[PDB]
Design a protein around this ligand. Structure first.
Ligand SMILES: CCCCCCCCCCCCCCCCCC(=O)OC[C@H](COP(=O)([O-])OCC(O)COP(=O)([O-])OC[C@@H](COC(=O)CCCCCCCCCCCCCCCCC)OC(=O)CCCCCCCCCCCCCCCCC)OC(=O)CCCCCCCCCCCCCCCCC
Ligand SMILES: COC1=C(OC)C(=O)C(C/C=C(\C)CC/C=C(\C)CC/C=C(\C)CC/C=C(/C)CC/C=C(/C)CC/C=C(\C)CC/C=C(\C)CC/C=C(\C)CC/C=C(/C)CCC=C(C)C)=C(C)C1=O
Ligand SMILES: CCCCCCCCCCCCCCCCCC(=O)OC[C@H](COP(=O)([O-])OCC[N+](C)(C)C)OC(=O)CCCCCCCCCCCCCCCCC
Ligand SMILES: CCCCCCCCCCCCCCCCCC(=O)OC[C@H](COP(=O)([O-])OCC[N+](C)(C)C)OC(=O)CCCCCCCCCCCCCCCCC
Ligand SMILES: CCCCCCCCCCCCCCCCCC(=O)OC[C@H](COP(=O)([O-])OCC[N+](C)(C)C)OC(=O)CCCCCCCCCCCCCCCCC
Ligand SMILES: CCCCCCCCCCCCCCCCCC(=O)OC[C@H](COP(=O)(O)OCCN)OC(=O)CCCCCCCCCCCCCCCCC
Ligand SMILES: CCCCCCCCCCCCCC(=O)SCCNC(=O)CCNC(=O)[C@@H](O)C(C)(C)COP(=O)(O)O
Ligand code: SF4
Ligand code: SF4
Ligand code: SF4
Lengths: 99, 157, 79, 208, 115, 114, 178
């Protein structure tokens, strides 16, 4: 940022870009190293009522996997299916489709 | 003391100055610590400004910066490239892995510190040590080999 | 087929084998029940025959080659 | 609704259940179990003889198109007769789906390699052999891939110790890097980090 | 005499430099120090084995082209001749023949490397 | 008591594969000693190969013998193509490792290990 | 959505001006010249090199450096030998032995941190319930022997006494976030 105007014009012409608007060296635009103290918010479970843990126990809602068929438990015109509907084709970008 | 002792001390100072102003590490690294090593090579810290320039072959290397986890499969290769370096050579262990195994100390395939394989001159702690810390270790090594008194010990023999 | 030549060069290599007493060695002496060797010693002997004769002997003949007489008539009917 | 619990969609569970029924009725010769987890993941547990037909069908069927093998691994559970559970995670880009195929093995029954189905299975099965000792039939070049040369034992097994049996050091008398029986300056302190109270009543096994 | 003197001075200087480089520092050489370098592992085979050359035809062409250069080099004295038409025609013929040979080899893929 | 074979139906062709592997090791030992600069002689290398085979000589299960042959062929390939180094080859000899004596008095004097 | 990085749309046909432009680009090395110009601009820029050790790279109060054991303002050790740091240490780099003191206080008789084993992750300082063990911001503590990085309780207490003027300020600046 201490470069003379001659050197700035030389650098801008040599690079083809306006380098002074976007300098890679931080001078003063950065945040101050000392900051005011924060006050972080509390989560949604920080309440004094209607907050029983059994109603929000996501860890204990895990069940053992459901057996679709078994060689011992089941002891065993419909259409063919797929694991999912086929993936929709991606649309070309309307912002910049080609470089 | 004797006049020749002063001349020998000054020659020792000259040799140590040359060897500490020209420290060429081998282009050798193993892990995240070697990533921090090339961040020391990066323009912020400029090991080249300090006179420290990587050379690929161990024959042109002066110091070996063991930067990463030395495994059992890697240990013969590390010993080989250390042995192929010429005699005024130094070793800078970098990071907890190269120091004492680190996070993989109790592993079946990890050498518990590269000092079991090569004689380490300087240990740089961290996981990873910052490029500041590695540069500090390099400067500490420069001071250590400034402290060497080879011709003075030879004269006192 | 130069039977005497092949048999005395077989006996020469068998003498060159260090685990066999040349005094106890004979043409009809078995490797296992007479010379007291192992199957590994026998296959080393067969490999010595291979590398002294210049032709390969398969493994299926190795368990049949039990005496020097078996070796010499085997290489006779092979050559 | 609840901010701390993962949202659950039933459509993926229904689709995976339907596809599991589909694969199970297509291949009854090899499929032993089909399950869908509560995390919406489909697992098909097959006989080891049907690894090649099952993987080939999943890769080349029009309704499957699982053309990408995500990974191949093994799990050592040393309390069953066939201790190594071989797991194939597969990705279908056509249907944007993932499937898991399981089979079993022990130390002395090799299973067929699927290098002829997926080429990534080459290095994946090399890793499985190196880490567990599960041999693979018809592999182009099966050997160790991660352990040291001449390493004895398969270290990802449960009974293999964490530190191993040997350690390397530079011996100056022989001027080499040599292997010694392992001695630790500080032993690895194992911890008993298991609460004596049951955490999940849904997984309570019945008493013996 | 002066050129011979300065060549000998260069020879003496470089011999002195390599001599002081070999006799000044402390020697400590052992087997692993002087074993050949193969990026940390032992060499699988000797480096004196045959090592295939994919530009051998280009090297032979380089021999012929270097002799074409040797033919073309007396031109700065050839341009001083009285009969400049003959010299100009002969030089044009030589360079055109050289260019036609290069074009024929380029067409016949001789400049491309094998395998 | 009826199991699926790996390669060998019984012990005979398993021993045939063992003999083939021993033959390959016996042929490869001099080339290894010449190629890797080994201090040992050719006699010592073949003695070590025989010692390893005799160490494994007590097994009678065809599947275990087949897997031992497969492992031996893997190590043989690691020696043929120079992937094992001088250190890896010399690790079979344990020349830097002192051996624990097998007698009760020496084990009593050394420590508590039986 | 997606985009093409190298696919060209339609064709530009052939023109004498375009052919001459491509000919000049091939013959006169135009992209090579502008690469030279870019390097020239970088030459005439200002380097980003600080003058170490007289200038140091910026850090934050959260920085995890050399370990230290702190005290209360009375001078009593903060550590109460609870072994939470030892339990949570992912590298098992902490060794703790303890007994009641002469006044009955629950204090350590051994607090060792193997800094060659430590991974500098801060789990000890975030598991400590009394802010005893911390990672103070020292990072220039490289040694010449492996032993000097095997810290014991005396070394850690000396580090806490040395760096208390900075560690307390960092904890003051940081503790509302944690
Ligand atoms: C020819 C050009 C010579 C260099 C020159 O004139 O540079 C000034 C100036 C450099 O511009 P700049 O890149 O913006 O300067 C960097 C900062 O802006 C300004 O830099 P700064 O503010 O950080 O400090 C600058 C200060 C720094 O002062 C010093 O470094 C003094 C050192 C004294 C040592 C005793 O002064 C100078 O650099 C004055 C010029 C010194 C030129 C020395 C040339 C001989 C070197 C030795 C030869 C033997 O040149 C020009 O603007 C035009 C250059 C072409 C002139 C024709
Ligand atoms: C993520 O994955 C990974 C990687 O992947 C990306 C890795 O890569 C990887 C490995 C990582 C590493 C090994 C880290 C290595 C770091 C880097 C690759 C980045 C560093 C960058 C470079 C090396 C590029 C450097 C470029 C430069 C331009 C620097 C210049 C360097 C040079 C070699 C050229 C300059 C030459 C020298 C320094 C020596 C020159 C001087 C001399 C030889 C002196 C000669 C002079 C004389 C003899 C003259 C004498 C005569 C006289 C008359 C003098 C008079 C004397 C008197 C006394 C009077 C790992 C582990 C990894 O995980
Ligand atoms: C023109 C460009 C090139 C210029 C080259 C440099 C010119 C200026 C050189 C000045 C220094 C000259 C002596 C360099 C000695 C370097 C090696 C060294 O220190 O060896 C220590 C050794 C020490 O030997 P020692 O007796 O301690 O034992 C060596 C053996 N060990 C260590 C294994 C027990 O040698 C000397 O001290 C020799 C001194 C020679 C002095 C000549 C003047
Ligand atoms: C100056 C360096 C060169 C030098 O001293 O060469 C001599 C050479 C050097 O051979 P060197 O390799 O033993 O050198 C000693 C080691 N440094 C390099 C550290 C000095 O020879 C000797 O020093 C001894 C040879 C016998 C001398 C007999 C008496 C001569 C008077
Ligand atoms: C020689 C040049 C050295 C470097 C000069 C500064 C580099 C930056 C210039 C600005 C820039 O980026 O221009 C890009 C531009 C190129 O931008 P472009 O890549 O967008 O191309 C323009 C578009 N077309 C394709 C139609 C041409 O450069 C030019 O326009 C000129 C480049 C060619 C001319 C210079 C190279 C050949 C010179 C040969 C004769 C020798 C000259 C004298 C040498 C004396 C010393 C030895
Ligand atoms: C009289 C003869 C001597 C004159 C002096 C010049 C000497 C030139 C010597 C070499 C000439 C070789 C020409 C033929 C040839 O080999 O062309 C090969 C080239 C394509 O080959 P390549 O460059 O390998 O391309 C990569 C694959 N596509 O093919 C091409 O590049 C095609 C070139 C087409 C145009 C030829 C020149 C036309 C000139 C018109 C001038 C009008 C005024
Ligand atoms: C340089 C040094 C490098 C050394 C490298 C050593 C290579 C180690 C290869 C080891 C390969 C094996 O272990 S295969 C051998 C195991 N197989 C068996 O034991 C088969 C059953 N065993 C037997 O039948 C045994 O009796 C015998 C002794 C093998 C055969 O005896 P026969 O006579 O009844
Ligand atoms: S000490 Fe940490 S950062 Fe360095 S190599 Fe080991 S794991 Fe990576
Ligand atoms: S920073 Fe992490 S690895 Fe280091 S002592 Fe603390 S808990 Fe252990
Ligand atoms: S967590 Fe804190 S109080 Fe507990 S033992 Fe560790 S340093 Fe002491």
């Amino acid at each position: 940022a201490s470069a003379t105007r001659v050197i700035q014009k030389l650098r801008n012409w040599a690079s083809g870009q306006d380098l002074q608007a976007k300098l890679q060296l931080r001078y003063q635009e950065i945040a101050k190293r000392t900051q005011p103290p924060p006050k972080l918010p509390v989560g949604p479970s920080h309440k004094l009522s209607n907050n029983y843990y059994c109603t929000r126990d996501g860890r204990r809602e895990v069940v053992p996997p459901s057996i679709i068929m078994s060689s011992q438990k089941a002891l065993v015109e419909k259409k063919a299916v797929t694991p999912a509907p086929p993936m929709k084709r991606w649309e070309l970008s309307k912002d910049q489709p080609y470089l | 003391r004797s006049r020749a002792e002063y001349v020998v001390t000054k020659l020792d100072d000259l040799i140590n100055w040359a060897r500490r102003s020209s420290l060429w590490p081998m282009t050798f690294g193993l892990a995240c610590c070697a990533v921090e090593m090339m961040h020391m090579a990066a323009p912020r810290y400029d090991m080249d400004r300090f006179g420290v320039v990587f050379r690929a072959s161990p024959r042109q290397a002066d110091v070996m910066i063991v930067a990463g986890t030395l495994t059992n499969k890697m240990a013969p290769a590390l010993r080989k490239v250390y042995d192929q370096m010429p005699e005024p050579r130094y070793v800078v262990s970098m990071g907890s892995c190269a120091n004492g195994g680190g996070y993989y100390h109790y592993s079946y395939s990890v050498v518990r510190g590269c000092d079991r394989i090569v004689p380490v001159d300087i240990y740089v702690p961290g996981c990873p040590p910052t490029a500041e810390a590695l540069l500090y270790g390099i400067l500490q090594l420069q001071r250590k080999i400034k402290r060497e008194q080879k011709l003075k010990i030879w004269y006192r023999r | 087929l130069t039977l005497d030549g092949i048999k005395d060069r077989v006996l020469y290599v068998l003498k060159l084998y260090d685990k066999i007493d040349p005094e106890k060695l004979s043409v009809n002496s078995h490797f296992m029940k007479d010379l007291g060797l192992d199957s590994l010693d026998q296959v080393e002997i067969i490999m010595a025959m291979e590398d002294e004769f210049g032709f390969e002997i398969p493994d299926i003949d190795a368990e049949k080659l039990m005496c020097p007489q078996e070796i010499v008539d085997y290489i006779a009917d092979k050559k | 609704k609840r901010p701390t619990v993962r949202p659950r969609s039933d459509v993926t569970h229904k689709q995976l259940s339907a596809f599991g029924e589909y694969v199970a009725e297509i291949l009854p010769k090899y499929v032993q179990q089909v399950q869908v987890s509560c995390l919406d993941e489909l697992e098909i547990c097959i006989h080891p003889d049907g690894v090649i037909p099952t993987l080939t069908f999943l890769r080349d069927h029009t309704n499957a198109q699982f053309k990408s093998l995500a990974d191949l691994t093994a799990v050592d559970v040393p309390t069953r007769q066939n201790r190594f559970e071989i797991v194939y995670n597969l990705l279908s880009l056509r249907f944007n789906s993932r499937i898991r195929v399981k089979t079993y093995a022990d130390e002395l029954t090799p299973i067929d390699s699927i290098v002829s189905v997926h080429i990534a299975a080459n290095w994946y099965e090399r890793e499985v052999w190196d880490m567990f000792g599960v041999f693979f039939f018809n592999h182009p070049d099966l050997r160790r891939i991660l352990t040291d040369y001449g390493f004895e034992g398969h270290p990802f097994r449960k009974d293999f110790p964490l530190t191993g049996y040997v350690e390397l050091r530079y011996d100056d008398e022989v001027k080499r890097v040599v292997a010694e029986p392992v001695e630790l300056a500080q032993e690895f302190r194992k911890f008993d980090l298991n609460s004596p109270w049951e955490a999940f009543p849904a997984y309570r096994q019945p008493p013996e | 005499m002066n050129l011979y003197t300065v060549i000998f001075i260069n020879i003496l200087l470089s011999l002195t430099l390599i001599l002081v480089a070999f006799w000044l520092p402390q020697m400590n050489l052992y087997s692993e120090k002087a074993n050949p370098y193969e990026c940390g592992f032992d060499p699988t085979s000797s480096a004196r084995l045959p090592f295939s050359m994919k530009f051998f035809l280009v090297a032979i062409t380089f021999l012929l082209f270097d002799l074409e250069i040797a033919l073309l080099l007396p031109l700065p004295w050839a341009i001083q001749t009285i009969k400049t038409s003959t010299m100009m025609i002969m030089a044009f013929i030589l360079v055109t023949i050289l260019s036609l040979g290069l074009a024929y080899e380029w067409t016949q893929k001789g400049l491309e490397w094998t395998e | 008591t009826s199991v699926k074979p790996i390669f060998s139906r019984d012990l005979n062709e398993a021993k045939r594969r063992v003999r083939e592997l021993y033959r390959a090791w016996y042929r490869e030992v001099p080339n290894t000693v010449h190629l890797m600069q080994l201090d040992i002689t050719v006699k010592q290398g073949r003695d070590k190969v025989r010692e390893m085979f005799m160490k494994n000589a007590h097994v009678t299960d065809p599947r275990v013998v087949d897997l031992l042959v497969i492992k031996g062929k893997m190590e043989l390939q690691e020696t043929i193509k120079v992937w094992k180094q001088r250190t890896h080859v010399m690790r079979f000899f344990h020349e830097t490792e002192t051996p624990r004596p097998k007698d009760f008095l020496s084990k009593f004097y050394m420590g508590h290990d039986p | 959505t997606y985009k093409y990085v190298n696919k060209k749309e339609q064709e530009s046909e052939v023109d004498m001006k375009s052919a001459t432009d491509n000919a000049a680009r091939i013959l006169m090395w135009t992209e090579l010249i502008r690469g030279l110009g870019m390097t020239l601009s970088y030459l005439f820029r200002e380097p980003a090199t600080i003058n170490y050790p007289f200038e140091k790279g910026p850090l934050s109060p959260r920085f995890r450096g050399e370990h230290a054991l702190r005290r209360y303002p009375s001078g009593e050790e903060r550590c109460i030998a609870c072994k939470l740091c030892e339990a949570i240490c992912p590298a098992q780099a902490i060794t703790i032995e303890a007994e009641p003191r002469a006044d009955g206080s629950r204090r350590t008789t051994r607090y060792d941190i193997d800094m060659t084993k430590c991974i500098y992750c801060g789990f000890c300082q975030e598991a400590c319930p009394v802010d005893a063990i911390v990672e103070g911001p020292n990072f220039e503590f490289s040694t010449e022997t492996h032993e000097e990085l095997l810290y014991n309780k005396e070394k850690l207490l000396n580090n806490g006494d040395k760096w208390e003027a900075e560690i307390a300020a960092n904890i003051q600046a940081d503790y509302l976030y944690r």
